[PDB]
A paper describes a structure:
Photosystem II (PSII) produces dioxygen by extracting electrons and protons from water, which takes place at the oxygen-evolving complex (OEC), an oxo-bridged Mn4CaO5 cluster with a shape that resembles a distorted chair. Here we use pump-probe serial femtosecond crystallography to reveal the structural dynamics of PSII from nanoseconds to milliseconds after illumination with one flash (1F) or two flashes (2F).
By Δt1 = 5 ms, these difference densities disappear entirely, indicating the completion of the electron transfer together with the restoration of QA and the non-haem iron. The distances from two carbonyl oxygens of bicarbonate (BCT; BCT-O1 and BCT-O2) to the non-haem iron increase from 2.16 Å and 2.28 Å in the dark state to 2.43 Å and 2.44 Å after 5 ms of 1F. At Δt1 = 5 ms, a large positive difference density appears between BCT and D1-Y246, consistent with our previous discovery, and the distance between D1-Y246 and BCT-O1 decreases from 3.21 Å to 2.82 Å. At the completion of Mn4 oxidation by Δt1 = 200 µs, a negative difference density emerges on O5, suggesting its instability, which is subsequently stabilized at Δt1 = 5 ms. In addition, at Δt1 = 5 ms, a positive difference density appears near Mn1 but outside of the OEC, suggesting the movement of Mn1 away from the OEC. These structural changes might stabilize the positive charge on the OEC. In correlation with the outward movement of Ca from Δt1 = 30 µs to Δt1 = 5 ms, one of the carboxyl oxygens of D1-E189 located close to Ca shifts slightly away from Ca. The subsequently decreased difference density at Δt1 = 5 ms could be attributable to a stabilization effect of the positive charge on the OEC.
Numbering used by the authors:
A (entry chain A): 11 to 344
B (entry chain D): 11 to 352
C (entry chain C): 23 to 473
D (entry chain I): 1 to 38
E (entry chain E): 4 to 84
F (entry chain V): 1 to 137
């Protein structure tokens, strides 16, 4: 029982209140670093010159922001994709002006969240579980990579990464629509099906199981006391639920195999959000949504507007106003 | 007493491939007409006289750009009955005036009522609790608030959403430019309900599938389940330990878990419906007054809040003339807001 | 029907190829038939590209991804990348197409006619997944093959015509590479560059001498390691670290392919040396720099002093400094100042863009090249309407760089998911709980409670 | 700044080594069923 | 089961296909002719490519009155020469 | 509205002679314009120099006048600056510079007339949209 084996057995121990594990060894310091910088920056960071034009944006609470307008502001467009750790600045004041905090937060967060996904695989191995919960988490994790790393890479700048804030998120979405017509991209449309469908099936499965709970309580007590943690028997009647839902639609539109029902609950939102993640990641390389601008032409050649053209009008409004001082030449090529 | 009423009851409630029921008398014609109106309209009907838009396959639109568009703003909130005073029984004029839109919206509303009565009716015959019907109140609250209350607060049906893919996208962008709807906390709660619903759906399904008991020998685990078995097919104890150690907390009560899954998306949709009720009256969350006072006086103060209003101002000025043709907006080039160069 | 239903094999039809794991003879067939599909597509797609090819239009206006690969190797093209002979494109396509029939023939024979298992038939072609010595020997054979493949590129560069060199004096031309870089500080120094802006890791290789010399090193390394793995068996530290199973080996390869797909995505997006802009179109950074160049030229012709023109922000309207002082193009393209390209470097002095060269030495061919790249920026819709998202229909264009990057990010992403899927399953199967928790032996019931 | 740089470099190297040696330390055997994996 | 004949039974039966090898193409051709005769245009009031505008006008024939909307459209249709 | 011979009748030269294009010429003009010109001139603007558009009024005040078939055909052979003072074949596609603008190598005289005709007819159809830019999209 030497000191390395002792340490390895503590790291991988299934008795720690929170599992550490080898992924946790990377996860814990990087998440702590990103969390601490985020909280400090959100409260007290001075304004940041996001678009490199000496026009600093205030993101913190102490500089005039509330919870809704506050953000950690992306690093300067002058930096582009250059690496900007604290030690590359002449001073902290320089680092703060140029959006240093943004880079520190997202690189530590992306490392930590990737290790969070490995940690989910790791604990499942230690407990004798099947391994694929982490595959479900790869969907939100891929989305975070898309708006914090991949989109900046294809566009050449972390200054077009998603801001770390509520109104900053909306800004990112609006400019994205102007520059990629994301609403008209089938991968965003599949993503909407993923999350609308996921919410529908969530309410569906919750209502059907709750509708077929087996009477185990009186009316003055919560029905939740009718289930006991660890009990061997199922708490609801899947045959009654399938009998209801099969009649609601038709018998073969209903699941009677709990395993494939639950697999379907897993797959539908995860696949949809993979496509949403891939939408952002491929619009990062400027393969944009469908363009039907002036697609319908009459016999003389007059343009006949469709709803696609009305969308284009709205997009032009976002295009011409965004980053109003940042363009000197007529095309916004990135 | 076995009169005609009870005999009729017998026939409506026969176990057949498609259950019918009393609710089916309302549900089936209304659902069928709403769907057939949408297919008829998107295949053959124009929006030229109401919007200045082509909107059918007949005209060259595709699945993304077809729509059944709203009536012209000058129709106000007219029911636009086929036999009413605008179309006067003329089926062709009715189509050109937007009569298909109220037709779809109204038959759809009553179709939705009939679907929910069907959930109640079947639940009562089978002997289950009616929570599926209660959960369906959230889609009904959304449909009623967006497609009926919202235009009823505005000037006419014209500003309701049109029934089409790209037409709904225009509705999203209108709501950003005019209402600053992303800023509205009722929308925010709805976003939380929908994304948290999708999250719970993914996480519950994945957790079950990865805590299964080995109840068979095959590598495909689906076969090792029997609908009448008495045992749980997955380990709630192992699932609980996994999540407590991964995330800190875990479900321990399976009934609470599944109620929560009902609760989260349903509450979210209800909250978003309330905010749209406000937007019927233009009662928006458009501004933060404290930000505007500071920014008016201090031309160096800039936030993501002030950056987004500039975008909304672009949206309004650049889309209004085409999107609201009845208003006759003529905006010369020199008045349009634009940044440098663009 | 050996293992051809769910009852015999344990695998449902939707996982039916898992029935092949221990049927090496049918597994051989599946792999060989599949390589035939790859070679078929390469052959047939080339011929399609050739049939649809107009030599007067730039390749990048024509939706070509394979002919640009052939042209980069020096076949069919002359100075400036002009097509002088389409016959090599024809040959490459025909020979790949004819070969796919041979591979398809072998694949179908082994898949349905030959021995299902090879162990009874040949101990040389037979294998057990758990035999660490045999698996590294098969691995060694394929490393030697890959190493020969890397040397074929060297042979083409040094002895059989050379490579297309976008940087060649006089506008770009095929050039024989006579002195490939062999200094391992150069070759391996690429591996230790930061991957961030201005460094770019191996994506930044910008001259053919380094490209060729790197393939010499890779060829030797693959041949050496291939001999090493024929002669050796995994060491004890290696034995204890890995899972030794078919599905495990698949998962390691899936991880490696995903990583390569991500690297290729960036290579084609940023690099303009082994993906010449003449053939692939300008990079995103390139087109953005080209716009600044175009309007500097236009406005200077009208009489503007572009050196001293203060823009609306206070930064120069045409020219400014990078954060380390270099003179760079202004406007939003400030983010792209790391771009290097043959049409721009003649204006570069020690301090960056040189104002005297800008004022005096801009040639018409540079104005031509910047205007062409500005108007072929890699932006466009999914239905191939070129330009920004708000542009009207007219121009049928999506850059090959966009097609190649988006496809390979999507494939690399799903191959990362496939790695997680098969690595997690390989681990669980090895340990014996990939089908579920044993009710009588549930590990969590033997553990102390957390609280 | 230079001192900060060396500290971070040393800190990061430290945790990466724990990660690598940790997974090198017979990790397949750290499961509740079959240990004998080699 | 609810007593109706299984779908798989029906759609593999020669009699099903004897009937529907006629009724399906007959309906398809009916839909085709509904468009190709130009009847669809006139049932629903949809402009042909040459009837969105008059030859020199560029204004939309937009309906602007609620109770004279029918006449407004009829007036717009006259003005197409 | 229809593409009529009136629409397709355009000035042949500066002296007032007209020529009437066929629908086939016009559609050929559109396709060839897309092939050789639209990368910079989509919609009648000029991406690499927005000060100059292809509106007929702008072409009328060029030197020599370019608002007719002969002026436009001559421009595609030997383009000049707006004031005619300089020859810009080295930077603008033309038959004179087909060696460096290879897409011009397979344009025949008949093709130049159809491209010219497209440029003169499109404003009669599109009005302000032609040469108007994004404001009129
Ligand atoms: C829950 C689950 C339910 C399930 C779904 C059930 C589906 C049932 C379908 C019912 C459809 C109701 C249609 C209501 C149409 C309407 O309202 O039509 C509107 C008309 C009023 O007409 C409007 O009137 C306006 C004001 O005009 C008035 O003022 C004008 C200007 O000064 C002139 O003076 C004018 O002459 C004068 O009439 C404008 O003229 C408009 O153009 C015109 O449309 O009211 C009327 O028919 C009647 C108004 C009184 C009853 C309203 C109660 C019902 C609606 C409640 C919603 C509240 C919305 C408020 C915003 C929130
Ligand atoms: C085992 C795993 C262990 C993990 C190791 C972790 C260590 C760090 C990981 C890497 C982090 C990369 C971040 C920066 C990526 C980037 O900016 O990438 C860009 C670089 C290329 O850099 C660019 O390279 C360019 C080189 O071009 C130069 O040279 C050219 C020569 O022709 C041209 O002349 C050109 O004009 C000229 O500028 C320039 O230097 C640019 O400034 C520079 O930005 O790509 C590259 O280095 C190669 C591509 C790197 C991979 C891309 C990451 C993708 C990850 C996706 C993950 C999804 C997961 C989903 C979860 C579910
Ligand atoms: C590249 C794709 C690919 C390849 C190479 C294979 C290969 C194989 N599959 Mg898999 N499979 C695939 C995709 C593929 N599969 C997909 C997409 C699915 C899901 C639908 C499956 C689901 C599946 C199941 C459920 C099973 C297999 C099985 C097999 C093996 C035996 C098949 C057999 O006996 O057919 C017999 C069929 C025929 C003889 C009919 C025609 C087959 C030939 C080969 C058609 C070739 C036509 C071609 C044009 C001829 C060219 C000739 C020319 C070169 C001269 C074989 C190695 C079986 C297995 O594992 O056995 C142990 C098995 O049970 N597969
Ligand atoms: C070299 C790559 C490779 C190889 C050799 C394998 C091999 C295998 N996989 Mg793995 N897998 C891979 C990559 C690979 N996989 C990747 C990249 C992913 C991420 C998506 C997966 C995800 C995955 C899962 C979730 C599972 C497997 C399984 C398996 C086993 C059964 C496979 C089968 O029969 O499918 C049969 C093939 C089909 C049923 C057809 C799928 C059709 C696809 C989805 C259509 C894709 C659309 C297409 C690209 C474009 C549209 C075409 C349309 C317009 C016509 C087999 C050992 C199974 C397993 O674990 O067994 C041990 C299993 O459950 N794989
Ligand atoms: C490396 C992959 C790759 C890339 C980058 C390209 C790129 C291109 N192709 Mg090529 N091609 C490919 C593979 C590729 N192709 C394959 C496999 C075939 C045989 C089917 C072809 C056959 C082909 C023809 C016949 C033609 C092209 C053409 C083109 C050009 C226009 C493409 C276009 O408009 O698509 C339109 C875009 C789509 C159809 C989007 C596809 C969406 C898919 C279905 C999503 C799949 C997602 C994922 C894979 C599935 C995951 C499922 C999940 C559950 C796991 C473009 C340069 C055209 C050209 O210009 O030639 C000169 C042309 O005519 N290609
Ligand atoms: C990697 C692919 C591969 C592998 C490992 C095998 C392996 C095998 N084959 Mg199969 N086969 C393949 C592809 C492959 N084959 C192809 C492409 C075809 C169509 C030509 C066949 C058609 C085939 C038939 C008809 C038969 C076999 C048989 C066999 C078995 C005995 C072979 C032997 O002893 O040859 C000894 C070795 C040689 C004769 C040396 C051959 C050298 C080749 C022909 C020259 C090229 C070498 C060079 C590396 C090629 C580069 C190709 C690259 C560019 C793609 C053995 C298991 C036999 C069998 O199954 O018995 C029951 C058998 O009867 N194969
Ligand atoms: C397809 C190529 C391939 C594959 C699959 C293998 C596989 C194997 N090799 Mg072989 N090898 C190869 C090519 C390959 N080799 C070549 C070309 C050579 C000549 C250089 C060798 C020389 C060689 C030797 C001397 C040894 C092996 C050994 C092994 C075994 C242990 C592998 C291991 O632990 O890696 C894990 C990797 C490490 C432990 C590296 C250190 C960890 C660092 C920190 C990870 C860095 C990752 C980072 C993201 C890097 C990004 C890029 C980077 C360059 C910047 C394994 C079976 C071992 C063995 O058992 O021999 C019998 C062994 O001693 N190989
Ligand atoms: C309105 C109205 C009415 C009614 C009418 C109706 C009722 C109709 C119906 C109609 C219908 C009922 C129609 C239908 C149609 C259908 C369709 C048109 C479909 C199509 C489809 C498709 C196209 C598909 C596609 C796909 C998908 C989606 C996915 C999968 C794959 C595929 C690709 C296949 C009346 C007379 C009363 C009165 C007057 C008014
Ligand atoms: C196994 C299996 C499978 C698969 C299969 C495969 C994958 C196969 C492949 C196959 C192949 C891969 C094949 C191929 C073939 C080829 C060929 C057969 C070719 C031919 C050619 C020719 C004849 C040519 C001609 C020509 C010339 C020479 C000149 C130019 C022109 C032309 C083109 C005409 C599946 C999935 C189904 C399932 C079952 C099992
Ligand atoms: C050709 C060329 C070149 C060169 C290249 C080279 C020379 C490369 C190399 C490369 C390399 C040399 C690479 C390497 C890689 C590695 C890797 C990728 C590794 C990985 C590892 C792993 C994955 C591990 C894992 C683990 C851990 C960590 C713990 C324990 C357990 C296990 C084992 C699982 C240049 C650029 C000059 C130019 C251009 C052309
Ligand atoms: C920059 C990264 C460098 C990576 C270097 C790769 C070189 C590979 C050589 C690894 C050295 C071998 O030494 C490796 O470490 C120690 C030696 O005390 C052992 O360590 C472990 O042994 C066993 C594994 O069964 C465990 O139960 C135990 O908890 C632990 O002590 C490893 O089992 C041995 O394999
Ligand atoms: C509305 C329906 C109200 C039921 S009405 C009811 O119907 C019976 C049939 O069972 C008759 O026998 C009875 O006389 C009649 O009043
Ligand atoms: Ca060996
Ligand atoms: Cl902005
Ligand atoms: Cl700019
Ligand atoms: Fe459940």
């Amino acid at each position: 029982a030497n000191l390395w084996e002792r340490f390895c057995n503590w790291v991988t121990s299934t008795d720690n209140r929170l599992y550490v594990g080898w992924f946790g060894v990377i996860m814990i310091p990087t998440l702590l670093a990103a969390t601490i910088c985020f909280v400090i920056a959100f409260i007290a960071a001075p304004p940041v010159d996001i678009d490199g034009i000496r026009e600093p944006v205030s993101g913190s609470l102490l500089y005039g922001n509330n919870i809704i307008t506050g953000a950690v502001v992306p690093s300067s467009n002058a930096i582009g994709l250059h690496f900007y750790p604290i030690w590359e600045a002449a001073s902290l004041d320089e680092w703060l002006y140029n959006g240093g905090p943004y880079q520190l937060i997202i690189f530590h967060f992306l490392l930590g969240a990737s290790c969070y996904m490995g940690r989910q695989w790791e604990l499942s191995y230690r407990l004798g579980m099947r391994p694929w919960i982490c595959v479900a988490y790869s969907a939100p994790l891929a989305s975070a990579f898309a708006v914090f790393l991949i989109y900046p890479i294809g566009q050449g700048s972390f200054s077009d990464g998603m801001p770390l804030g509520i109104s900053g998120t909306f800004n990112f979405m609006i400019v994205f629509q102007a520059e990629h017509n994301i609403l008209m991209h089938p991968f965003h449309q599949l993503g909407v099906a993923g999350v609308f469908g996921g919410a529908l099936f969530c309410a569906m499965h919750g209502s059907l199981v709750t509708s077929s709970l087996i009477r185990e309580t009186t009316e003055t007590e919560s029905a939740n006391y009718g289930y006991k943690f660890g009990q061997e028997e199922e708490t609801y009647n899947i045959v009654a639920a399938h009998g209801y839902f099969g009649r609601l639609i038709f018998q073969y539109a209903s699941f009677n195999n709990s395993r494939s029902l639950h697999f379907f609950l897993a797959a539908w939102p995860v696949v949809g959000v993979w496509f949403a993640a891939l939408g952002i990641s491929t619009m990062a390389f400027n393969l944009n949504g469908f363009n039907f601008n002036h697609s319908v032409i009459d016999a003389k050649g007059n343009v006949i507007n469709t709803w696609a053209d009305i969308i284009n009008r709205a997009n032009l409004g976002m295009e011409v106003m965004h980053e109003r001082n940042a363009h000197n030449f007529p095309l916004d090529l990135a | 007493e076995r009169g005609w009423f009870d005999i009729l009851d017998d026939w409506l409630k026969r176990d057949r491939f498609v259950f019918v029921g009393w609710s089916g008398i309302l549900l089936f014609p209304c659902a069928y007409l709403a769907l057939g109106g949408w297919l008829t309209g998107t295949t053959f009907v124009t929006s030229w006289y109401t919007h200045g838009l082509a909107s059918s396959y007949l005209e060259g639109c595709n699945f993304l750009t077809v729509a059944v568009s709203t009536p012209a703003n000058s129709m106000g909130h007219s029911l636009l009955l086929l036999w009413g005073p605008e179309a006067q029984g003329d089926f062709t004029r009715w189509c050109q005036l937007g009569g298909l839109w109220t037709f779809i919206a109204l038959h759809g509303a009553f179709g939705l009522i009939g679907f929910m009565l069907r959930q109640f009716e079947i639940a009562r015959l089978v002997g289950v609790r009616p929570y599926n019907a209660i959960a369906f109140s959230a889609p009904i609250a959304v449909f009623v608030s967006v497609f009926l209350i919202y235009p009823l607060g505005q000037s006419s049906w014209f500003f309701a959403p049109s029934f089409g893919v790209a037409a709904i996208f225009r509705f999203l962008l209108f709501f950003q430019g005019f209402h600053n709807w992303t800023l509205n906390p009722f929308h925010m709660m709805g976003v939380a309900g929908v994304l948290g619903g999708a999250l719970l759906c993914a996480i519950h399904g994945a957790t079950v599938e990865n805590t299964l008991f080995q109840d068979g020998e095959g590598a495909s685990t689906f076969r090792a389940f029997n609908p009448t078995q008495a045992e749980e097919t997955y380990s709630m104890v192992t699932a609980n330990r996994f999540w407590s150690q991964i995330f800190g907390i875990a479900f321990s009560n399976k009934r609470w878990l599944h109620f929560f899954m009902l609760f989260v998306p349903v509450t979210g949709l209800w909250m978003s419906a309330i905010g749209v009720v406000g937007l019927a009256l233009n009662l928006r969350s458009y501004d933060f007054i404290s930000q505007e006072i500071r920014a008016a006086e201090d031309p160096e103060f800039e936030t993501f809040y002030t950056k987004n209003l500039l975008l909304n101002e672009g949206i309004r000025a650049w889309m209004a003339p085409q999107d609201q043709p009845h208003e006759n907006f003529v905006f010369p080039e020199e008045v349009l807001p634009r940044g440098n160069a663009l | 029907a050996t293992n051809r239903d769910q009852e015999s094999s344990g695998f449902a039809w939707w996982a039916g190829n898992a029935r092949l794991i221990n049927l090496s003879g049918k597994l051989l067939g599946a792999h060989v038939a599949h390589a035939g599909l790859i070679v078929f597509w390469a052959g047939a797609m080339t011929l399609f590209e050739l049939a649809h090819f107009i030599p007067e239009k730039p390749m990048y206006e024509q939706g070509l991804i394979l002919i640009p690969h052939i042209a980069t190797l020096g076949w069919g093209v002359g100075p400036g990348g002009e097509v002088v002979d389409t016959f090599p494109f024809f040959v490459v396509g025909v020979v790949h197409l004819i070969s796919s029939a041979v591979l398809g023939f072998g694949g179908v024979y082994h898949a349905i006619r030959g021995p299902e298992t090879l162990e009874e038939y040949s101990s040389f072609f037979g294998y057990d997944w758990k035999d660490k010595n045999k698996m590294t020997t098969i691995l060694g054979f394929h490393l030697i093959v890959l190493g020969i493949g890397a040397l074929l590129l060297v042979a083409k560069a040094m002895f059989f015509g050379g490579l297309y060199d976008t940087w060649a004096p006089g506008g770009g031309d095929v050039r024989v590479i006579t002195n490939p870089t062999l200094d391992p500080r150069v070759i391996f120094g690429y591996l230790l560059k930061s991957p961030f802006g201005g460094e770019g890791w191996i994506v930044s290789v910008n001259n053919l001498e380094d490209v060729v010399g790197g393939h010499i090193w890779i060829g030797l390394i693959c041949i050496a390691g291939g001999i090493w793995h024929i002669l050796t068996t995994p060491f004890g530290w290696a034995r204890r670290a890995f899972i030794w199973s078919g599905e495990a080996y698949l998962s390691y390869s899936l991880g490696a392919l995903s990583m390569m797909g991500f690297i290729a995505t960036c290579f084609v997006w940023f690099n303009n040396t082994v993906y010449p802009s003449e053939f692939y179109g300008p990079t995103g950074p390139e087109a953005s720099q080209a716009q600044a160049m175009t309007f500097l030229i236009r406005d200077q012709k009208l009489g503007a002093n572009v050196g001293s023109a203060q823009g609306p922000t206070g930064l120069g309207k045409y020219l400014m400094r990078s954060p380390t002082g270099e003179i760079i193009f202004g406007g939003e393209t400030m983010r792209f100042w790391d771009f290097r390209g043959p049409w721009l470097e003649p204006l570069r002095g020690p301090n960056g863009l040189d104002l005297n060269k800008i004022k005096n030495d801009i040639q018409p061919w540079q104005e031509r090249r910047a205007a062409e790249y500005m108007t072929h920026a890699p932006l466009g819709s999914l239905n191939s309407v070129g330009g920004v998202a708000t542009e009207i229909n007219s121009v049928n264009f999506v850059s090959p760089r966009s097609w190649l990057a988006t496809s390979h990010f999507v494939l690399a992403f799903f191959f990362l998911v496939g790695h997680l899927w098969h690595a997690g399953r390989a681990r669980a199967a090895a340990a014996g709980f990939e089908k579920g928790i044993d009710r009588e032996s549930e590990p969590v019931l033997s553990m102390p409670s957390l609280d | 700044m230079e001192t900060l740089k060396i500290t971070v470099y040393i800190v990061v190297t430290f945790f990466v080594l724990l990660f690598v040696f940790g997974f090198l330390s017979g990790d397949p055997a750290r499961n509740p069923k079959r240990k004998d994996l080699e | 089961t609810t007593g109706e004949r299984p779908f798989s039974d029906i759609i593999t039966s020669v009699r099903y296909w004897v009937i529907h090898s006629i009724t399906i193409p007959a309906l398809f051709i009916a839909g085709w002719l509904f468009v190709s005769t130009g009847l669809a245009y006139d049932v629903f009031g949809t402009p042909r490519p040459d009837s969105y505008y008059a030859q020199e006008q560029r204004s939309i024939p937009l309906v602007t009155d609620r109770f004279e909307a029918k006449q407004q459209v009829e007036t717009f249709l006259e003005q197409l020469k | 509205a229809e593409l009529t011979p009136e629409v397709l009748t355009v000035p042949l030269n500066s002296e007032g002679k007209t020529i009437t294009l066929t629908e086939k010429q016009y559609l050929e003009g559109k396709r060839l314009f897309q092939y050789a010109c639209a990368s910079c001139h989509v919609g009648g603007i000029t991406k690499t120099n927005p000060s100059l558009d292809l509106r007929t009024e702008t072409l009328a005040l060029a030197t020599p006048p370019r608002d007719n078939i002969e002026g436009l055909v001559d421009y595609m052979k030997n383009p000049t600056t707006y004031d005619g003072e300089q020859e810009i074949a080295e930077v603008h596609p033309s038959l004179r510079s087909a060696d460096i603008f290879p897409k011009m190598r397979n344009l025949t005289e008949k093709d130049l007339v159809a491209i010219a005709g497209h440029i003169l007819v499109e404003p009669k159809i599109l009005g302000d949209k032609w040469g108007g830019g994004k404001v009129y999209y």
